[PDB]
Amino acid sequence: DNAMPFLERPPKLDGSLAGDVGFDPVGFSNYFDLRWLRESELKHGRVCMLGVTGLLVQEAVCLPQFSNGKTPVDDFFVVPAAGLWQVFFAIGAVEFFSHGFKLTPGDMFSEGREAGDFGFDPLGCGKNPDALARRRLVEVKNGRLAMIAFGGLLHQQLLTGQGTFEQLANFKAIA
Amino acid sequence: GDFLIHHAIALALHTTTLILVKGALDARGSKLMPDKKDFGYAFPCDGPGRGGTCDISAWDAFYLSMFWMLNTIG
């Protein structure tokens, strides 16, 4: 249906993309490329799924070669600077090779690339078409959920200073 | 005092140069006497016509710059 029934449905939001509930009140996709916006939405979503898994795991696990922070966000400040720089350039190399060296909005989609697609299915979960369509919508909604959830986990961990699960087991309101 | 007198000397050098340069460059001709080169270097004037032409020769610009040279060295 229409997500915001009093507002008119945005003209560029056809139902073809998965996760389309007609929710564009501010007015994007009337200015920017929906192909670029969808690539940004899936990229943000997958990064935040990995981020929420990383936050939960680092609250428990720690590699022996690394120290342990007070919180998984404090884990950033005890890993050596050169390590962070190596991770940054490794992610940059992946970003370069995956997009074929076209990263700008102007050239990223000059090769007829499909938004969110990098030809990544080693386990072949997208072999079936209808199952693939369902997994597309599942992906976009789990990505959206992990985006909000990552925001929540990071800010509560900064505020309380006591993790996620230890925070829940020792909940202490603002005083 | 040395600043003010150096600027006065500069004015005197430029003015003496102006009369001498104007005399050299207008020596061959001007708008009053375009054929000034046919008459030479030292001639009195071209007469009272065309408004008056006293001191129009290149020699007369030597004459006028001699007062400014004396003023400058003064």
Partner: protein, 174 residues
């Protein structure tokens, strides 16, 4: 054409009986100055906020949520506001109403475009305005009660400034 509400004055030439709460009351000609759809949306917004404000004054005088009495004691009405600005309560309310108002800005701009009735956020979770006559009766009623609560809220807060009591204890005493 003379005004039904102010008989010696003319009909205000921008107001029509298809509007809700129409009585022909625009003596100063303001409906000619501003756009009328903006004025209607502003009136319904003022109406609903003041209805909530009046009910909140009444309810706050009757009872108070657990724990609130310790943080704010003898203070009431505007007096609690400053205390709750120190705590995070007022700021959190401002944040979430501001979030709703961003979409309300988009909704109002669509109203001025002419694609939405003023005050129409399509919000009817329980079913009351199924039938058309009941929808009209509610529409006239909601503007009438909102107007009454606008003047009510005014009276309540000004009585608090004069006496320091608030609506219910001002009824009880004097």
């Amino acid at each position: 054409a003379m005004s039904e509400s102010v008989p010696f004055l003319k009909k205000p030439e921008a107001l029509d009986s298809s509007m809700a709460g129409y009585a022909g009351f625009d003596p100063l000609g303001l409906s000619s100055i501003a756009d009328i759809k903006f004025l209607q949306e502003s009136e319904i917004k003022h109406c609903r906020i003041a209805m909530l404000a009046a009910a909140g004054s009444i309810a706050q005088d009757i009872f108070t949520f657990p724990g609130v009495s310790k943080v704010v004691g003898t203070a009431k009405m505007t007096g609690v506001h400053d205390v709750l600005v120190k705590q995070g309560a007022m700021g959190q309310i401002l944040l979430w109403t501001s979030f709703l108002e961003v979409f309300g800005t988009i909704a109002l701009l669509e109203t001025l475009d002419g694609k939405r009735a003023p005050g129409d956020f399509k919000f009817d979770p329980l079913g009351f305005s199924k039938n058309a006559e009941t929808a009209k009766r509610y529409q006239l009623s909601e503007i009438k009660n909102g107007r009454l609560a606008m003047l009510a809220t005014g009276g309540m807060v000004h009585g608090y400034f004069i006496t320091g009591k608030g609506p219910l204890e001002l009824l009880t005493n004097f």
